[PDB]
Each structure stands twice: as C-alpha cells, then as structure tokens.
Amino acid sequence: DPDVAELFFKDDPEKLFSDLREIGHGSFGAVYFARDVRNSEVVAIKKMSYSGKQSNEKWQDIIKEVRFLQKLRHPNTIQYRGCYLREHTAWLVMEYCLGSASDLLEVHKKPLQEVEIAAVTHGALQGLAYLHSHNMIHRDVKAGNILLSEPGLVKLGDFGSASIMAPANSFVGTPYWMAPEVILAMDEGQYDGKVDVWSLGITCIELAERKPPLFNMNAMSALYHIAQNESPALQSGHWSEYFRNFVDSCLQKIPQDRPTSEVLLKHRFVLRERPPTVIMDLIQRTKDAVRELDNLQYRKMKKILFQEA
Ligand SMILES: [Ca+2]
C-alpha cells in the first residue's frame, strides 16, 4: 500500500476526533469543524471519499493534495496536520480557521472596511509570494479561499487546484476570478503565478463590493468577457488611491505589465500602517454579529461560533 504507508498516519481517525460539524463541501467531499480528543484542540478535517463512483481519480486527487500540503511552511498558508485513512475515506487534518473572507461578507452583508481589506489582502499576498517563490501557483484565489484564524491571522486555503510548477497551462480556477491568460490557455498557452495576482485583484473588488465583477452573467459569458474585454476596477471613487492603484496594478491584462506578488509586497496599499488589532477586531465584530442573527440555530453562518458549542 505504497502511498498509504508513505503519506498517512496509521491511527483510526474515529478515535482521535469528535464533534464533527460540516463547515463546507465540494466535489472532493466535505470539510468539518472537529475536536482533537488528545489535547482538546479544535481542528478542521477535509474528508475525501474515493469509492463513490470510481476510486481512481478521487484517490489521485487525494495523494496530490496531501503531497502539496506537506510542503507548506508559511504562516499565511493553512497549516497541515497530517492525514488518516478509514473505509475508503481519507481524513486530511488542518488547523482550524473559523471563517473565510467570504463568510465575513455574508455575515455583515456589507463590504469590509478598507483597513480590513488591506490587512486581508496583505496576508493573502504574503502567502502567494511564498508559493510563487517555490514556483507553485494557487489558481483559485477568491474570498472563499482566504481564511481567518484566531488570534488574528489570514491564511490561504483550498490547494485543490494548485500547481506545483510554473509555467502551467491547465484550464482551472473559478470563472469569475480567472486571469485572461488562464482562459487563453483554453486554446494552448501557458501562465505564471501572476494569474494569482490577477485573481487577488478580483478578490480585492469582491471584498470591496461583495461580489466579483461579472457575477451577474453566467460562467461561460464571463469567461469570454474576461478575455476579450477591458479590465474591471473598483467602482467607487471613495476608496483611497493606494487601494485603487493596488487593484489596477493586479488587473493589468497582459502578464508582462502585471507585477509579481513579490513586487506587490512593497506596494503602498499594503505597507500603509494600520492598527495591529485589525484582523482580531474584524473577527470579534463578526462573532458578535453572528450571535445576534435571527433564528441562529437555523442560520448557516452559526458555524463561525462552533468552537463555543
Ligand atoms: Ca500541464
């Protein structure tokens, strides 16, 4: 059992974790909030079954992600804690992040404050520059994959579409956030980690406006429009120039004009001094808002307070 013996711990996850509560799902399967019985610590577990239809590809997806996750050692990437295997289900365990940037947008039904967008953007950017420095590409940067964790850190999540080498040429990502060069690859081309810089630019707008541009058209049309049309920009003139320029820089259409994530780490938007408690306060005000939600037991965003139950 080659990859099994190599990549997994032998323990039975069922004896290690309890209070599993679903906090997300996708084709892979589902992600869960859980409690590590050994130290009374909360963790996140992504269960990936490989029996459903055809074990084959699901199993390959599992191994690739485990191997990818094993390589990450940066504070702005989700911390991987190991994996277990039981009944055709791989349990990938990770540190727990109580919410994504997207959940934040859903709880307040309002864009984030600019200082908060800067703090979220900066953290995700650091993670991208780290991934890029090792020639990897995330390929699915969006508010839903930027996670918050206490006491107050921003971490990149969901490496299910990631590439371990640049240049890359696969059609992958989430339509509205995909860079033109990735869509162009739809024919036969290649692209950089710069595509993540583009996706980050779209995410910045999503954090400022709750949705990415083109969210009002179907996926196929958006794809055609991203490629063949001008670049979107923040629509309100009220955001500072630093933010405005940061976003327009990320959204340069031709890779060559787009800066690398490393260069962006020196951008004024990201370097402008901000209170040291921004993320922490953002999380606290979010937890507080969720507690006031009407009919909480039935509101999906209650997951933000799972660690209290
Ligand atoms: Ca390839």
Curated annotation (Swiss-Prot):
ATP binds at I23, G24, H25, G26, S27, F28, G29, A30, V31, K46. Residues 17-270 form the Protein kinase domain. It is found in: Cytoplasmic vesicle membrane; Cytoplasm, Cytoskeleton. The active site is at D140. Staurosporine binds at E95, Y96, C97, G144. Autophosphorylated. Phosphorylated by ATM. The modification Phosphoserine is found at S170. Signal peptide: none annotated. Self-associates. Interacts with MAP2K3 and MAP2K6. Interacts with tubulins. Interacts with MAP3K7 and interferes with MAP3K7-binding to CHUK and thus prevents NF-kappa-B activation. Isoform 2 interacts with PCDH8; this complex may also include CDH2. Serine/threonine-protein kinase involved in different processes such as membrane blebbing and apoptotic bodies formation DNA damage response and MAPK14/p38 MAPK stress-activated MAPK cascade. Phosphorylates itself, MBP, activated MAPK8, MAP2K3, MAP2K6 and tubulins. Activates the MAPK14/p38 MAPK signaling pathway through the specific activation and phosphorylation of the upstream MAP2K3 and MAP2K6 kinases. Belongs to the protein kinase superfamily. STE Ser/Thr protein kinase family. STE20 subfamily. This is Serine/threonine-protein kinase TAO2. It comes from Rattus norvegicus. The gene is Taok2.
